[PDB]
């Protein structure tokens, strides 16, 4: 037998995320100890 398409996603040549136009990693700011105000500069679509 050959190696099956389910197994071939691991080796990860053509099966990688198309991550070029993605604007950044979506997360909070780090914790750093009260209350902190934050203006929404803009809302964008990635």
């Amino acid at each position: 037998g050959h190696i099956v398409r389910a197994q071939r996603r691991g080796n990860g040549s053509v099966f990688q995320a198309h991550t070029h136009h993605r604007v950044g990693p979506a997360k909070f700011r780090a914790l750093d100890a009260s209350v902190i105000s934050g203006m929404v500069k803009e809302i964008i679509h990635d």
Binding site: G1, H2, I3, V4, R5, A6, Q7
Partner: protein, 46 residues
């Protein structure tokens, strides 16, 4: 697909043949189809 490419492949008439529902213990290459399915079929109620 033909028998070499995938587990379900091959035969004169297209059909699965083997039970088509496999364990957590089953290997790479072997985990194809419904993995550890404690139920199958139409989920009527519940």
């Amino acid at each position: 697909m033909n028998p070499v490419d995938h587990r379900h492949g091959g035969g004169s008439h297209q059909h699965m043949g083997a039970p088509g529902t496999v364990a957590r213990s089953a290997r790479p290459g072997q985990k194809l189809g419904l993995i550890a399915s404690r139920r199958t079929g139409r989920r009527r109620g519940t």
